Each structure stands twice: as C-alpha cells, then as structure tokens.
Amino acid sequence: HISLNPDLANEDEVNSCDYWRHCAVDGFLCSCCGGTTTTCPPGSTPSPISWIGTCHNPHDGKDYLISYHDCCGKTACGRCQCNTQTRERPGYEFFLHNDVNWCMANENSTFHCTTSVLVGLA
Amino acid sequence: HISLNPDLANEDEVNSCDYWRHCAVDGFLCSCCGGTTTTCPPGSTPSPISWIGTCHNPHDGKDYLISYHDCCGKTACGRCQCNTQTRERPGYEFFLHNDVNWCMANENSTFHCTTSVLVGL
Amino acid sequence: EVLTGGHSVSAPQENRIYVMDSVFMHLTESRVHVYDYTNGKFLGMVPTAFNGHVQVSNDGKKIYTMTTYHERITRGKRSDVVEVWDADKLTFEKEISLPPKRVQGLNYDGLFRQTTDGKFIVLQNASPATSIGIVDVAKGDYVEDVTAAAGCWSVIPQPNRPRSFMTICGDGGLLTINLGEDGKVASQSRSKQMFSVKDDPIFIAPALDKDKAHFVSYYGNVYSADFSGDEVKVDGPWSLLNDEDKAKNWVPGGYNLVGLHRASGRMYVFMHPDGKEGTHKFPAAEIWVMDTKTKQRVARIPGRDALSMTIDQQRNLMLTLDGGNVNVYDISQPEPKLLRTIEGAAEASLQVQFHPVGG
Amino acid sequence: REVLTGGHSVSAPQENRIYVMDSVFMHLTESRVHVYDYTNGKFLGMVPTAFNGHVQVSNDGKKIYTMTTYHERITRGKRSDVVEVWDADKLTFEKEISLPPKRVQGLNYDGLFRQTTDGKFIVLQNASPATSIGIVDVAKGDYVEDVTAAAGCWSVIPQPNRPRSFMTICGDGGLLTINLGEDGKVASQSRSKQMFSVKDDPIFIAPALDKDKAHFVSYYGNVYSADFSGDEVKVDGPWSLLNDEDKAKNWVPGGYNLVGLHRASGRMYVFMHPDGKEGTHKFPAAEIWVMDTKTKQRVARIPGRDALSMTIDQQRNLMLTLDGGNVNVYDISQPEPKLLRTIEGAAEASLQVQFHPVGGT
Ligand SMILES: *[C@H](O)Cc1ccccc1
Ligand SMILES: *[C@H](O)Cc1ccccc1
Incomplete structure (x- = not known):
C-alpha cells in the first residue's frame, strides 16, 4: 500500500508529527533534516538500538511495529520536532521508552534526529 | 553622582540597552546575568582586555570613556542582549571594535556577558 | 571602576532555585539557571555540556x-562525568570519572540522586543495559555499579x-539497595509486585514522604511503597478519580508530575481531561x-500547562514548570495560592x- | 521491511547549494553551518562548528x-583552535589542522576566513588581541606561519x-598587499598610499570585489577603491553614493557583509537606511x-527586507540577502533585482x- 512507502508520499505529509508511523517520536524528524524516513542526513550515523512503537495505519487499517532509530554524531537538527507518545512506557519497559537518547551507545552519542523504521505487522 | 553609580540606580534602568553607559555593547548585560555593571556573575572571569566606547551622560552632559570588559568562561548568559554601536569602528581600529569576542585572550574564551566599566571623562 | 570576579551569589541559599535547562534545540549547551524564587x-548559571543533569548537595x-x-564534541573520545561545583561561587571544583554509560535522557529527578546522608551520589546508567552507579563524594570516585538493578529504572532515596x-x-x-559506609552494596531486598507493568503502568516520579x-x-x-521497615510493603491501587472525573476521562500527565507535602499528607498531581493512549505527557x-x-x-486549581513540579517542605512551597516559565505557589493551606510566575x-x-x- | 542507513550524499546537486553560517549566538558553543537548496x-544538511565557527567552501567546490x-571541557581545559576539512557531498569530517590559539573569535565577516585564488592556502585572521594573518597549507595540513607584517590591520581580501x-x-x-611563495611564506609585500581617513570617513571592511x-x-x-591590476595598488575616492535628496534624508550604508559587486556589469549592491547618524552603521x-x-x-533601489548581509553569485547572476534568520533570493541579471523567494528560518x-x-x- 502507498501508505507504507513514505518516499512516494507528499513531503508535507511525511514531515508532519501526525503522519501515522511517527506515533512515538521524541525528536526531530530526519526527513526534515536532509535525510528521509529511512536514511540519515549526510554525515550522521544510524543508531544500532532504538525504542519501538506500535502504530495504527489508518490508510490500510492495520497495526505495524515501528523501530525509532536515531541518527547520531551531529548536533541537534532543530526541525520538525515531535513528541508523540502512543504506547510509550517508562524506563522500566526500557525499549518502549522515548525520554532517553537512543544515540546513547553510538561512537558519538550527540543526538541529531529521529525516524520511524517500519519493521512489519504487529 | 547618581548617574555615575549604577549600583544605587534603578535596576530596570541599568538593565536596559538604552542606559547611557551601554552605548557600544555587543553582548548580554552582565547586570542581567547575576552580576552587576562592574562585577562578573559568580564563576565567570573578567577579561583583561576590552573594546572602548565614548558615551554621552545625559545627566551631567559630559562624555565618558567606557571599557567593555567581558566576563568569560561560562556559556552565553542569553539575557539583555544589546547591540549598540555609538562610536564603534571596524577591526582596523581594533580596540574600538565590538564584533570580536573580547574574551579571546582569557584562559577560557567562552563568552558569557559584557560589562560597562567607567574609566573616566 | 574596575571589573572584578570571585563573587558569590547575591541572594541567600534559602531563596535559590535551580532550573535545569536542557536547551534541547542545542542540547550540547545545556545549563542550570539559578533564580531567586522570591x-x-x-542569580547565575552552571554550564552542563550535553544533556546535563543536576542536583544540590543535601547540606546545601x-x-x-x-x-x-567528547574531545571534539561530535567526535573523539567520550568522558562521562560528575562535577562538583561550589554552590555560592558557582565555580567548578572536581571532576569524577564515570564509565561511559551515564543515562542520557530527559531530567526526571530519579536519574541523578543522592543518599539521605549526602555521602553518595546515586545515578542511573544505560548502555542500554541498566544499572545504578554509586559515587563517593568525599573520595571523588565511582565506587560501585549495582548490576542487581538490571531491568529497573530510576532512584528513589529513602529519607x-x-x-x-x-x-x-x-x-x-521495587528493589531496595542499602549501601555500606564504603558505598558498596551492603544489602538488598525485593518487594512483592506493586503494579501491573502492562495493565496499569505507573509514572516513575515519586510523591515521597519520610x-x-x-x-x-x-x-x-495510586500505589504506595511503605519503607518504615527493612522490607518494603506495597499497596494499591486506589483511584484519584470519582465518577464525575471518570466521565470526562481525567488522567495524570507530565514528567516530574507529583509532589507530597509531608506535614499534611497532601499529594499534588498534574491532571488533564480526555485522557487516552498517548496523553501521559x-x-x-x-x-x-x-x-x-x-x-x-480536597482541591483542584488551574494547571497553567505545567509539566513538572517540586515541593519545599519547610516554607510550604510548590514550584511548577511548563518548559519555560516557573510558577511559585504557597501550599501552606490545602488550596495552593499562586504568588508569581518567573517568565523565560x-x-x-x-x-x-x-x-x-x-x- | 526497512533499514536505516547512513553514508549518503547531499540530495541536491552542488549548484543548488548555499551555506548559512548560524552563529547561534544565544548558544554560541553550538554554532553550525546549515546547507540549503536555494532553488x-x-x-539539505549541516556541519557542526562548535564555538563561533567560520566557514568557507574550497574554490574547487x-x-x-x-x-x-x-576546549577539553568546553568552558575549561586546554584550547584547540583548528581548521577542519569536510567533504562537501558527504558532509563528513576528514582532517583537522591545528592553529595557534589566537584564531579570530568574532562575527562572520567574509574577510576573516578566506583562501588564495589558487585554492592552495587558507588565509585567516588572528587576534591575540595583536593581529596577524595566518596561512594554512591545505594539502600539507600545516600552519605555515604568522604574517606579523599585518599587525594593526584587519581582514583578508584576496586578489582574484x-x-x-x-x-x-x-x-x-x-592597504597592505601580501604575496605568498609556493611554500605559503611571505615572498613580498607592499603598502598603498592612504585610501581613506580612519578618523573622518571610516570604511566598512566588506569589499565589493572585482577581478x-x-x-x-x-x-x-x-565609495573608495583599490585597483590592483598593476604591480602596486592604486587607491582612489571618495565618490558619494548620495544625491541631494539622499543627503537631505541622511541615507547611509549599514550592515555587516553589506556590499557586493556583479563583476560583468560593474553593478555594486549596498544596504542603505535613512536617518543615519553616529551608531547606525549596523x-x-x-x-x-x-x-x-x-x-x-x-540605477535601482528596492526594499531592504531588513537585510544585514549579502552574497553575489557571478555565475548565475544572483544575490542572496540575509536578515539574521531568513534568506532572500534575488535575480540580478538586470539592473533592478527581482525577488524570487524567501527561505524562512x-x-x-x-x-x-x-x-x-x-x-x-
Ligand atoms: C531521541 O533519542 C530522544 C532523546 C531524549 C533525550 C535526549 C536526547 C534524545
Ligand atoms: C562581546 O565580546 C562581543 C562578541 C562578538 C562575537 C562573539 C562573541 C562576543
């Protein structure tokens, strides 16, 4: 479905905090930061770890597992800041928690931007 | 007397970019930053060097030399930013120029805030 | 005139508050702003580099x-540290080296705490595996890593x-850790289950009594953990909500979202209507x-879009914070009275x- | 289904790119360069530049x-002043070149951080506060030496x-002219006659630079000029930007990087404001x-949009202006500039x- 392929969507739709897959983002959307939904802006490094969310796709009616990987090693992008919290939980459910820097284990932990990587059906 | 002693004057007046002795400040007024016009906020270090302004005192009608010493070694105060340029000149008259960090020679050059030190007439 | 340094904060300690500014837009230049709440x-500030956390020593x-x-901020070798600063001169005194796993995250109180006696700093690590680190303040050393706390989160000191x-x-x-006078674990215990992680997750912020x-x-x-004895006794839930409250879907929300006034037993909680999944902040x-x-x-008052709070027991004050502005309340009586707002x-x-x- | 990857290049071609040097004065330790597509x-991306960064693009692009x-601990510890070389397409760090701890800290005038026409040397302003010009051999990755001859001078105007x-x-x-040898050391120098009165008619340092x-x-x-077509610089001026009506309303220039020259036409662009007096030059x-x-x-006058700085592209006949936060893109192929768009924020x-x-x- 078209709703699963952000690179085919209108940029304004994907760059919005209301875009369906951004349902647990605490950060700057990488697609507003010179990257795309699944590519880091030039010179920033993907995080090997992430918080994970389950987001409802209203376009096909199905729920999807999203992995919120950050891009790291550059200072704050500052664009398209989101703070959405669907199904987000505190640090005692650590990988569901978005108030921690998921760049924390990178070679350089400076936080640049966040994104929402589609894993598959929930 | 009163126009030469900011510690006795109204704080809202001294913390304004229009205060007469702030006539060539490019920075954050230290008096808004936990300091006073002539004292650095706690934990920030005076600069030994400065740019100089000649500012008109509208109370006694005389012009005074003001030395704009920075306080250094803390990150930007962010309060009471001014960008006044009376008698300011470019870097070829270097000590009249305020687009350079007068903390540049300090042990730590991070710019915190700018003071307006009265030298004399 | 002569510009001088070496000065102390101009207002007495008892007037001072500490606003931890993450400066998330420029998170490498986080800092603590010191204000007079009166x-x-x-009054001054302390620079705290990337995503700083802060506390004041219990002795003030x-x-x-x-x-x-990092050596070059965005590249080079990482150094995680605790720094000790003089509270009156706002000057750096000592750096204490930490292993490179101190928690990077938003400023919940429970990520950076200290023992009641003030002798040990107790901090949360995430690598992302979690553990609790212990710093001996006097020695200026990281002395213990509590791996027993793996899979746990945040530090609630027992007053x-x-x-x-x-x-x-x-x-x-809850896992209770009792440190010895060396800062090493002296004993530990685990409570019975207090809350269902899946069905009724709690906010980590405690409303902390003695x-x-x-x-x-x-x-x-509402859940409780009673530590009057060596073994923690847990209870709950009781509901914050009456039937009218339930009809409008009132729920808590915020970050450091609760507080306790110890003399009265009053608990303060940020609430909003139309609660549903995703509204907890x-x-x-x-x-x-x-x-x-x-x-x-017993009472309800406008929230002023606040997210975080803190309580001063002895002056009967509550501060609230909306991200940028601090509201000062008198809580000497059951209805809080707004005294002032510190903007910006x-x-x-x-x-x-x-x-x-x-x- | 998807995997996040890095290693990518800037999405728009080089010819679309502009570089906005964000001092972030409120948080000056996190200055950075923002890369935008002006079209x-x-x-498009960014380059972090720590405390009060300056930036230029290599002449070869x-x-x-x-x-x-x-500093080792930002607000304390040992100072390291550096030039960094970054790949333009990947926006990645490649090399650090150590400088003596006196590189100019100040607002982003073009002339504080420049390069020779041949691209072999970076030429930068130092201030300790004594002034000198530093020369960096880019390929060798070395600081050659201080041009101490430039003491009491300010800013770098390359001779194209x-x-x-x-x-x-x-x-x-x-003006002091410095000619470097192939090693980056001073091979010769010369000093012009007085161009302007420092006391009576101070000039803005920003040049409107022709070949x-x-x-x-x-x-x-x-307006003053320095002609370097011959082996010694010939200086001239003043001529006035102002007619009687202009003078009567006290029009004067103001800004930072406040002028530009369109070389093919000889058109000079200048930010101006009325009611000029002591203190209005910025x-x-x-x-x-x-x-x-x-x-x-x-030959033309148009609204300033509160601009403070500009730059000219000779190859596409464009002018950008900048008010501190927003970039205005102008077509300057005709005498009257035409506003194409504004890039907000x-x-x-x-x-x-x-x-x-x-x-x-
Ligand atoms: C995205 O990693 C969330 C985050 C939280 C706190 C600091 C930095 C980033
Ligand atoms: C006050 O020192 C002026 C200034 C200019 C540029 C950077 C930092 C400070």
Whole structure:
C-alpha cells in the first residue's frame, strides 16, 4: 500500500508529527533534516538500538511495529520536532521508552534526529 | 553622582540597552546575568582586555570613556542582549571594535556577558 | 571602576532555585539557571555540556552535575562525568570519572540522586543495559555499579535511612539497595509486585514522604511503597478519580508530575481531561490536591500547562514548570495560592529544584 | 521491511547549494553551518562548528573548510583552535589542522576566513588581541606561519587576478598587499598610499570585489577603491553614493557583509537606511541600492527586507540577502533585482551566507 512507502508520499505529509508511523517520536524528524524516513542526513550515523512503537495505519487499517532509530554524531537538527507518545512506557519497559537518547551507545552519542523504521505487522 | 553609580540606580534602568553607559555593547548585560555593571556573575572571569566606547551622560552632559570588559568562561548568559554601536569602528581600529569576542585572550574564551566599566571623562 | 570576579551569589541559599535547562534545540549547551524564587531575579548559571543533569548537595554547600563530553564534541573520545561545583561561587571544583554509560535522557529527578546522608551520589546508567552507579563524594570516585538493578529504572532515596534507595523494576516491584559506609552494596531486598507493568503502568516520579512513597498511574490510580521497615510493603491501587472525573476521562500527565507535602499528607498531581493512549505527557489542565490519608481529592486549581513540579517542605512551597516559565505557589493551606510566575526561566526545562535548607 | 542507513550524499546537486553560517549566538558553543537548496528552500544538511565557527567552501567546490575553537571541557581545559576539512557531498569530517590559539573569535565577516585564488592556502585572521594573518597549507595540513607584517590591520581580501596574493586594511587607512611563495611564506609585500581617513570617513571592511579592483563604502556613504591590476595598488575616492535628496534624508550604508559587486556589469549592491547618524552603521537595510560603478550613479533601489548581509553569485547572476534568520533570493541579471523567494528560518543568528562555487576559474 502507498501508505507504507513514505518516499512516494507528499513531503508535507511525511514531515508532519501526525503522519501515522511517527506515533512515538521524541525528536526531530530526519526527513526534515536532509535525510528521509529511512536514511540519515549526510554525515550522521544510524543508531544500532532504538525504542519501538506500535502504530495504527489508518490508510490500510492495520497495526505495524515501528523501530525509532536515531541518527547520531551531529548536533541537534532543530526541525520538525515531535513528541508523540502512543504506547510509550517508562524506563522500566526500557525499549518502549522515548525520554532517553537512543544515540546513547553510538561512537558519538550527540543526538541529531529521529525516524520511524517500519519493521512489519504487529 | 547618581548617574555615575549604577549600583544605587534603578535596576530596570541599568538593565536596559538604552542606559547611557551601554552605548557600544555587543553582548548580554552582565547586570542581567547575576552580576552587576562592574562585577562578573559568580564563576565567570573578567577579561583583561576590552573594546572602548565614548558615551554621552545625559545627566551631567559630559562624555565618558567606557571599557567593555567581558566576563568569560561560562556559556552565553542569553539575557539583555544589546547591540549598540555609538562610536564603534571596524577591526582596523581594533580596540574600538565590538564584533570580536573580547574574551579571546582569557584562559577560557567562552563568552558569557559584557560589562560597562567607567574609566573616566 | 574596575571589573572584578570571585563573587558569590547575591541572594541567600534559602531563596535559590535551580532550573535545569536542557536547551534541547542545542542540547550540547545545556545549563542550570539559578533564580531567586522570591522576586524572579536571575542569580547565575552552571554550564552542563550535553544533556546535563543536576542536583544540590543535601547540606546545601555544593552543586553536582552529570554530563558527557567528547574531545571534539561530535567526535573523539567520550568522558562521562560528575562535577562538583561550589554552590555560592558557582565555580567548578572536581571532576569524577564515570564509565561511559551515564543515562542520557530527559531530567526526571530519579536519574541523578543522592543518599539521605549526602555521602553518595546515586545515578542511573544505560548502555542500554541498566544499572545504578554509586559515587563517593568525599573520595571523588565511582565506587560501585549495582548490576542487581538490571531491568529497573530510576532512584528513589529513602529519607528515613542514611544510604538506602529504591528502584522500579520490570516485574512491577521495587528493589531496595542499602549501601555500606564504603558505598558498596551492603544489602538488598525485593518487594512483592506493586503494579501491573502492562495493565496499569505507573509514572516513575515519586510523591515521597519520610517513610513511604506514592506513585500515580497512567489511568489515575495510586500505589504506595511503605519503607518504615527493612522490607518494603506495597499497596494499591486506589483511584484519584470519582465518577464525575471518570466521565470526562481525567488522567495524570507530565514528567516530574507529583509532589507530597509531608506535614499534611497532601499529594499534588498534574491532571488533564480526555485522557487516552498517548496523553501521559500532556501539560496540566489542573493541579489536583489529594489527601493521601482519606484517599480523596480536597482541591483542584488551574494547571497553567505545567509539566513538572517540586515541593519545599519547610516554607510550604510548590514550584511548577511548563518548559519555560516557573510558577511559585504557597501550599501552606490545602488550596495552593499562586504568588508569581518567573517568565523565560529556561528554553526547554522539565526540572526545577529548590536549594536544600534541611541539612 | 526497512533499514536505516547512513553514508549518503547531499540530495541536491552542488549548484543548488548555499551555506548559512548560524552563529547561534544565544548558544554560541553550538554554532553550525546549515546547507540549503536555494532553488526551493529545502534543508539539505549541516556541519557542526562548535564555538563561533567560520566557514568557507574550497574554490574547487569539493570541500567545506571550517574554523573553530574547542576546549577539553568546553568552558575549561586546554584550547584547540583548528581548521577542519569536510567533504562537501558527504558532509563528513576528514582532517583537522591545528592553529595557534589566537584564531579570530568574532562575527562572520567574509574577510576573516578566506583562501588564495589558487585554492592552495587558507588565509585567516588572528587576534591575540595583536593581529596577524595566518596561512594554512591545505594539502600539507600545516600552519605555515604568522604574517606579523599585518599587525594593526584587519581582514583578508584576496586578489582574484593573482594565485596567492591578498590585501588587508590597515590602521593608517591604506592597504597592505601580501604575496605568498609556493611554500605559503611571505615572498613580498607592499603598502598603498592612504585610501581613506580612519578618523573622518571610516570604511566598512566588506569589499565589493572585482577581478582586479575592490570598492569599499564608508560610514557616511562614500565609495573608495583599490585597483590592483598593476604591480602596486592604486587607491582612489571618495565618490558619494548620495544625491541631494539622499543627503537631505541622511541615507547611509549599514550592515555587516553589506556590499557586493556583479563583476560583468560593474553593478555594486549596498544596504542603505535613512536617518543615519553616529551608531547606525549596523542597522538593517531599509533598501538595497544598485550602483553603476563606472557611471557612479544609482540605477535601482528596492526594499531592504531588513537585510544585514549579502552574497553575489557571478555565475548565475544572483544575490542572496540575509536578515539574521531568513534568506532572500534575488535575480540580478538586470539592473533592478527581482525577488524570487524567501527561505524562512534558515538560521537563528546568521550574518553570512555563501553559494557553493560553480566554475570560477
Ligand atoms: C531521541 O533519542 C530522544 C532523546 C531524549 C533525550 C535526549 C536526547 C534524545
Ligand atoms: C562581546 O565580546 C562581543 C562578541 C562578538 C562575537 C562573539 C562573541 C562576543
């Protein structure tokens, strides 16, 4: 479905905090930061770890597992800041928690931007 | 007397970019930053060097030399930013120029805030 | 005139508050802003590099920060540290090296705490595996790494013991750690399950009494952990909500979202209507004031979009914080009275703290 | 289904790119360069530049050069002043070149961080506060030495008609010309006659730079020139930007990187404002004036949009202006500039924008 392929969507739709897959983002959307939904802006490094969310796709009616990987090693992008919290939980459910820097284990932990990587059906 | 002693004057007046002795400040007024016009906020270090302004005192009608010493070694105060340029000149008259960090020679050059030190007439 | 340095903060310690500004837009230049709550005057600041955390020593003499440096900020070798600063001169005194796993995250109180006796700093690590680190302040050393706390989160000091604290674990119970005078674990215990992680998750922020702690849940329930004895006794839920409240879907929301006034037993909680999945960090529509003995609300006031709070016991004050502005309330009586708002105290703060006066 | 990857290049081609140097003065330790596509306002990426970064693009368009200051613990510890070489397409760090701990800390005038026409040397301003010019051999990755001869002078104006020559403005009101040898050391120098009165008609340092001459505007709206087509610099001026009506309303220049020259036409662009007096030399532009430097007459005047700094692209006939936060894109192929678009929120506190170089040999 078209709703699963952000690179085919209108940029304004994907760059919005209301875009369906951004349902647990605490950060700057990488697609507003010179990257795309699944590519880091030039010179920033993907995080090997992430918080994970389950987001409802209203376009096909199905729920999807999203992995919120950050891009790291550059200072704050500052664009398209989101703070959405669907199904987000505190640090005692650590990988569901978005108030921690998921760049924390990178070679350089400076936080640049966040994104929402589609894993598959929930 | 009163126009030469900011510690006795109204704080809202001294913390304004229009205060007469702030006539060539490019920075954050230290008096808004936990300091006073002539004292650095706690934990920030005076600069030994400065740019100089000649500012008109509208109370006694005389012009005074003001030395704009920075306080250094803390990150930007962010309060009471001014960008006044009376008698300011470019870097070829270097000590009249305020687009350079007068903390540049300090042990730590991070710019915190700018003071307006009265030298004399 | 001559410009001088070496000056101390101009207002007495008892007037001072600490607004931890994450400066998330420029998170490498986070800092603590020091204000006088009595008049809103800016008193000074402490720079805290990338995503700093802060607390004041229980004796009031020192400020502790926790931060991360790199040799070239965005590249080079990492140094995680605790720094000791003089509270009156706002000057750096000592760096204490940490292993490179100190928690990087938003400024919940429970990520950077200290023992009641002030001798040990107790901090949360995430690598992302979690553990609790212990710093001996006097020695200036990282002395213990509590791997027993794996899968747990945050530090709740026990104010009735000198070197004891609890953490919230993935089983929905609490792990209690009692440190010896060397800062090494001297004993530990695990409570029974207090809350269902899946069905009624609690906010980590405690409403902390001398011998017990209360916690609120995503759905507006209250749980408690009583540590009057060596073994923690857990209970709950009771609901914050009456039937009218339920009809409008009132639930808690915020970050450092609760507080306890110890003399009265009043608990303060940020609440908003139309609660549903995803609203647990919404700004407060109201502050509710709960009598924890009767388990009933006594008052409700406008929330001013606050997200975080803190309480001063001895002056009967509550501060609230909306991210940028600090509201000062008198809580000497059951209805809080707004005294003033300090505007522009921070660009992006979720934590304010009073200077300790209790020793 | 998907995997996040890095290693990617800037999405738009070089010829679309501009560099907005964001001082972030409110948080000056996190200054950075913002890379934008001027054709559509799209944000393309960024380069972090620590405390009060300066930036330029290599003349060959392959690399971004930054200049900055680090300390071991930011506000304490040992200082390291550096030039960094970054790949322009990947926006990745490649090399650090150590400088002595006196690189200029200050607002982003172009002339504080420049390069020789041949691209072999970076030429930067030092201030300790004693001033000197530093020379960096890019390929060797070395600081050659201080041009101490430039003490009491300020800023670097490369001579576009020579491979490794530049000028600086001195406190005597003249220009010092430095010619470098192939090693980056001073091979020869010369001092012009007085161009302007420092006391009575101070000039803005920003040049309106032609291939073989530079024009400068003054605090009072006069124009001076330095002609370097021959082996010694010939200086001239003033001529006035102002007619009687202009003088009657006290129009004067104001801004930072406040002038530009369109070389093919000889048109000079200048930010101007009315009610000039002592202290107004950094005021935002009420207008942009377009002067024919041959006829010494104004050929256009348009709204200033509160701009403070500009840059000209000779290859596409464009002018960018910048008001601190927003970038305006103008077509300057005709005497009257035409506003194409505004890029809002390009920076929090920028006084310098620059094009990615196209051609220019
Ligand atoms: C995205 O990693 C969330 C985050 C939280 C706190 C600091 C930095 C980033
Ligand atoms: C006050 O020192 C002026 C200044 C200028 C540029 C950077 C930092 C400070």
